[PDB]
Design a protein around this ligand. Sequence first.
Ligand code: FE
Ligand code: FE
Ligand code: NA
Lengths: 392, 392, 515, 74, 132, 132, 168
Amino acid sequence: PQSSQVTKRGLTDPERAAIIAAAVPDHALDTQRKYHYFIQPRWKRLSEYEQLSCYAQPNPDWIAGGLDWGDWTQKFHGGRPSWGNESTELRTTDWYRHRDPARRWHHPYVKDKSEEARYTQRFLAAYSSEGSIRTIDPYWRDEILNKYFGALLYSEYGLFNAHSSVGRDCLSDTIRQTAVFAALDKVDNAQMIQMERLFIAKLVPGFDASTDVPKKIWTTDPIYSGARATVQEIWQGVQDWNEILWAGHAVYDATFGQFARREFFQRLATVYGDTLTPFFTAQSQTYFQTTRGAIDDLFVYCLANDSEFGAHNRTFLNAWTEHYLASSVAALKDFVGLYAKVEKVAGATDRAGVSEALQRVFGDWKIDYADKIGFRVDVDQKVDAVLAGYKN
Amino acid sequence: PQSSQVTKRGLTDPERAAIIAAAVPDHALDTQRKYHYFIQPRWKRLSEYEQLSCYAQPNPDWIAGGLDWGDWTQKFHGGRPSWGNESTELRTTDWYRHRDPARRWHHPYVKDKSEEARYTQRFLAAYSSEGSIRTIDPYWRDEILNKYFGALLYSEYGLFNAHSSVGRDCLSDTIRQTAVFAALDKVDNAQMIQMERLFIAKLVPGFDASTDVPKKIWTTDPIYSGARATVQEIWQGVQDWNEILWAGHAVYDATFGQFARREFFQRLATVYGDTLTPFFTAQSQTYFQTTRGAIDDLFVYCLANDSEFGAHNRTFLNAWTEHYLASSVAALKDFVGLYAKVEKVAGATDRAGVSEALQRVFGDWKIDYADKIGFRVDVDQKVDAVLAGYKN
Amino acid sequence: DALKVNRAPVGVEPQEVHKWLQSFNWDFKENRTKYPTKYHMANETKEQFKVIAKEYARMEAAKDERQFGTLLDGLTRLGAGNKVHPRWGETMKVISNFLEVGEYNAIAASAMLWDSATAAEQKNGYLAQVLDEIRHTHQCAFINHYYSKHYHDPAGHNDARRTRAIGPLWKGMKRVFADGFISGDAVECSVNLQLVGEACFTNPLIVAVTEWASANGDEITPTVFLSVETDELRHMANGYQTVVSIANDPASAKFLNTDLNNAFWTQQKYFTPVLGYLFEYGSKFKVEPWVKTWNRWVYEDWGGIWIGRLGKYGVESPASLRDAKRDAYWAHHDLALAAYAMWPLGFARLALPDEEDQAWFEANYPGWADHYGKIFNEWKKLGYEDPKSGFIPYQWLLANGHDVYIDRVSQVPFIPSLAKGTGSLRVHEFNGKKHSLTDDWGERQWLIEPERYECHNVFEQYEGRELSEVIAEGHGVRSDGKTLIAQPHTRGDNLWTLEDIKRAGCVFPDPLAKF
Amino acid sequence: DALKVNRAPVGVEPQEVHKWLQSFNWDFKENRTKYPTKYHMANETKEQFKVIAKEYARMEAAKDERQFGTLLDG
Amino acid sequence: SAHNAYNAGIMQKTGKAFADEFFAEENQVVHESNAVVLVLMKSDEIDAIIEDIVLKGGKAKNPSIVVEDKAGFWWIKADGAIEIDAAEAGELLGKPFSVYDLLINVSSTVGRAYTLGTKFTITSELMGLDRA
Amino acid sequence: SSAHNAYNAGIMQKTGKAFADEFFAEENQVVHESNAVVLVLMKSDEIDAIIEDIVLKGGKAKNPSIVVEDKAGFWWIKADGAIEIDAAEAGELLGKPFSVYDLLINVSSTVGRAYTLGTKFTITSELMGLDR
Amino acid sequence: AKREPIHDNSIRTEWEAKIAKLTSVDQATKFIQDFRLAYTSPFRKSYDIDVDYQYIERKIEEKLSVLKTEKLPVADLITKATTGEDAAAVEATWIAKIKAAKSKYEAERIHIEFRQLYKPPVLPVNVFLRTDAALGTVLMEIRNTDYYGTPLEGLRKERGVKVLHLQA
Ligand SMILES: [Fe+3]
Ligand SMILES: [Fe+3]
Ligand code: NA
């Protein structure tokens, strides 16, 4: 036995189920069965993503778009509201407008990453059994990949922590979900970089997967000097949560981050015989494009084209872009000094190869971000600015 | 209303639930709750994989290991039994002994491949958005990858269909599951090769993803002459289901298949700037090692070491190996003529690079298969035989 | 070039890959089936459900996650595993494990269709079907696996893969949806397995049964069985494509009507009495008369939507249908007599029909009370349920001249002196061996094809042996080594032991010795 | 080298990555909280449930599948 | 259309009346039927499809549709054909729902079934035999 | 056994005025240190097997103070000192992969200091970082 | 008659003792062919070991197969029957034999006797399965020609059964 009563279930206990059946009316008391039917659908019909996310944040009418009323029940010492317009320079007619084009609420997000989590481990057990590490260029593996791809995890880690204040300060539910999912993907990138290094250590005797060398390079090597200065500022130098998201994803990671991950480590892996790294960069680059879709909607669809504050917001976005683009080309100018340490491959690591890589990064960024907010940029000028740090 | 009665559920309807509760005894009628507790466990504890799979095949006692008795109820015209010892030369004390080391029943199998299916499409949507195809060597893309990797799908397709008679003829449940899962992975490989070609066609104008050229190469190009002859024989030339599984997976696909997929297309992708193909070869190579574990258990653990028929089975396995290794060495001798069409890369496509690739494949195969059945093989002799087809 | 490319997000949908599957085959002289067949017509067809390997797994894994969520989370938290009426919990020992062997043999049969297919798209579709039948094998196993863990009698749920070999009803199961599929013409499987088996009999066997489970408190089986049948849409579609090509070639079409009739009789000979017995006698709450279930699914819908529609193209109504309809009305009542009389040879606990059941039987089958009802009530008065009675009805049958025979072809038991369903005993001696046949259709099969039908029956194997020794040898006991798995009642007390069986002194005779 | 390597099947468990997480931080003058607080004590501690991003997603998705299966199906 | 009901025709009779028609001479051969039978296992997505698609736009197009509750599944019978557009269901459910996802809970079919684009169809037509 | 760890132990046995008198007694207006721990496991196939074959056998054999109560949707467990569950033991019981992460799928609540050490989950009355 | 236990009885034990004394491929081939002619198929000579012959046949197969691998060269295992005949010639001989049969009754006995004589390990498995399938094709086709043409009374006479009982 037990001290407390074994509760009878109303669903299956005959006596309680009969009582419930007598109390339930023989008809529905309303016909509106669409959960939060009054959400304005972005697409042709209301999505489950919107139903579960939208208006979860209890904003009052004095925060643009809020449906509630009155002041907060408890504020900070001094009077800072729980959420407030003072949290960002940007303005809108409705902070709820943002929609992730991937329509990620929590379940589809972890569902997809769970697939990547389990398949990765099956890939590693098979890769180690295949012995494919035997054909990788050892200099690339030991002197470039282990040290400088390892150092790059600190860039992804810093971008992850830049979201801590964003997760507290931002003013709507869909934005908060976008920000947090982007943060996890960044710390995932840094953890996946370390996972590959620990994995290689099991295959190559003498290969040191410790973070001692990568951390020393990230903190003192001039190759990452500009990048680390930019990450420290975006992470800990600002609290405007829109500035952090824009500078982090739309400027820095869209230029330096894409060049380092895609143009250097992923691309050069496929010229130095690295059959392992492309599996890991496949994930970080997938995460980048997913994040970009949501970041693009927040800043381009919603903020840069807000019916009342579009030009107002572009003024700040232009100023932020000018500052953080200068930071990013300075980071790239420092970073391209790493080509002086790699084995030369024509069309990839020579001046023409690096120039064409910079033209892709700056050119794609002009189309994906600059053109959409009215930021004028001379692509060739930025390429030549970075190439000034390339040793011929 | 409706013409038929709305059946009341015994679980929730008060009247029927009370009747059921009065009829159910107040105690269990046995304490043995382990489903098929009498299965001899391979590992320290009985697994759910074994519980759901083992003795599903209703073999009688005159088929080694069967628990039933008597003749079949209906046989073929002439007298061929539903299952029979005449289906294979190999003998054992118990056909039920085989265990997939991955312990795959149907659910974990489709669960894992579902992860790969959905992640693949997310990877392709991001890869196309990344534009990473821009840095691939166009000659490799158009003249080697599209044509000869496309031709390789027909090898995977033929190996898939080689399992059709095995799925009917084999004599136990765990063996049948191993064979069918291996067959799906092969036809998956052929479909994934075509998927990559169709994907490239959406990114490169003028890139023809039709199978006309790959099929013409598979059926008429001397580079695939030996491979196609071997696949036709394993698929349609024999019905001994143990010979098919051994010749297909343990000899041909372990030698020619591993060289083509891993040493040629996957490896050279990482010297010609191909950031796309490694994502697809990652899957086929994962599938190969999973299949190998199950193939290894059937032929090495169970058959080559069966207490009564081990040496008997090794006699047949040795004869099969000698024949199909010669076929595979002739296939590789034809195949290495493809190196005359590739751009020369020191250590990868020169004679020394091809020699080391053959040493890995033949060397791994001696350790993974030949040593385990007592098949003596001179690796350097087999390497030099293939290199006779290499154009200096 | 190196700078400009279309960066629109694209993938590759399954139908984009599928359109090129037909070109994956190539021509060579040995590219043909390995199995004997009468059908050699052109059969390059297109499959109606485009599927590739990656999408196959995605579809099935999605079905599984919802199914196992219901079983392992929700229903377990509700304790639903022990909310089943004992009659139906015992019935699922037989239904799920017997279907399991049908699913398992369907793997091998689908592999023959895979092997005998000539179009790459058709080989692709049959591999998916082969995989589905593996899934269904493990689904059926999982039902008994779950019952073993949560139901008040795990014995028989936990070991049927060996305890089924004891009893005679298992012999016929190895033909109806097993040997009858895989031991014959490979492309003919499109007729017996698919046009008949999947398109006709899976609906009452797998779908309709779920309403009987729910009526008797079982929500585990509907969760699984209804998921099983979702795969059958592709299986039926695969077979229909081949049946079309057979009907279109005059040389192939001349085999179709005979193969159809033989398939329909072979399957219905066992399916009709056994499933009808398990539905009506292995339940407390009845959904409908079994003969109405059979009329709705077999005669009217399958016979009308498939066979009747195909009549426009030379497919004939099965000549054995008249004999089959008589079986639909009475044969499951005949089988109940043999099942109750030989209960110690099974692995399930049986329940004699109570007064409410008897009224239902007589209302829906007038004449049942004066025949079957009087027999069951006489057995009860003799102590059918009482372990100390020393009474087992099989000896009672013999003492009153009600011999039980086994059809050499179908393995279905036959009691000619008590049967109301289709049948008449034919006893032939051939080459010094006696054979008993029970209907016009099976006797033709045996007379023309004797080397296909050499199945030993329980009387030939058990001849002269005492009942309790056969049961003990076959592991037909619970974990105490003495109490029988099978029981003549569904109560928790007064369970029969091997010694209780032994006191009756039942010895297996040679039923053909008198001929 | 190019021929010999350990081909034993290995992966990387979550705890293997997690042991290096503490080294992901680096020192700089602005590396401190943005919010007002009365608490400024040393607080370099270890979390009792080692988790990384991939393993977090695997755990929660497994919970979800059973939960949504029960709701939408059973 | 009551002729498509589960208990239509002979299924209304019981006792001797049922047996008399069941064993009648004209009922010892099959009778061609222009109907189709669709079975959908109950679930959140399917019950929404039944109420707002099959019993609305479905039965508006095909008034012969009969839907019956069989505890664990839906029983559907109609003349000629039954169709379900996965794109319409996807708009109803508010979540990704391809034609492959629709088949997750499509349990049984009596008739010729296929998928054409986003639409699932079960039809009385004998494709490959009947004139196109 | 140990009745002091029962859900309805002590004051929880009383009703009416008797309960109110002790609930409002002067000595019960401050918290009292407890050496106990409370573990909650939501019901499922895996958990119900763990409860019967681990917690109520070897668990209570090590810690005879363990009390387990049925709370419809979950298990209520209370014991002196600590409660431990070895995922490796559960994996041997279930016959399927079962890491300590998989064990936590249905571990709902904890009152005490909880942690994972290898394959073992433990909730303890010890104040780690403060005690000893 | 009283049958002994199913899986362990004096008949199986006694026959296992006979099998253990086979020492050559020739002796075991004659042993297995005589056994299959005497105890298998509807045209067997004796049903005296009916519930044991299939298990005993398995044990004879195992003995002959091990003797083959111990004594015969590899090429003989692939291209020759243990009678010494060329395997391909055996296939062609029996395919031609059944294609010349003038009735299903002639065709059925050719297929049955082929299996009795050349079932593995006598013939190599690959050759046997090819021939068995080719023979079964012809047998199926001639049997399914006018399947219902002959009444049961005529079929009983054509088969040659002794009709012991016909229920009224
Ligand atoms: Fe099935
Ligand atoms: Fe099927
Ligand atoms: Na501070």
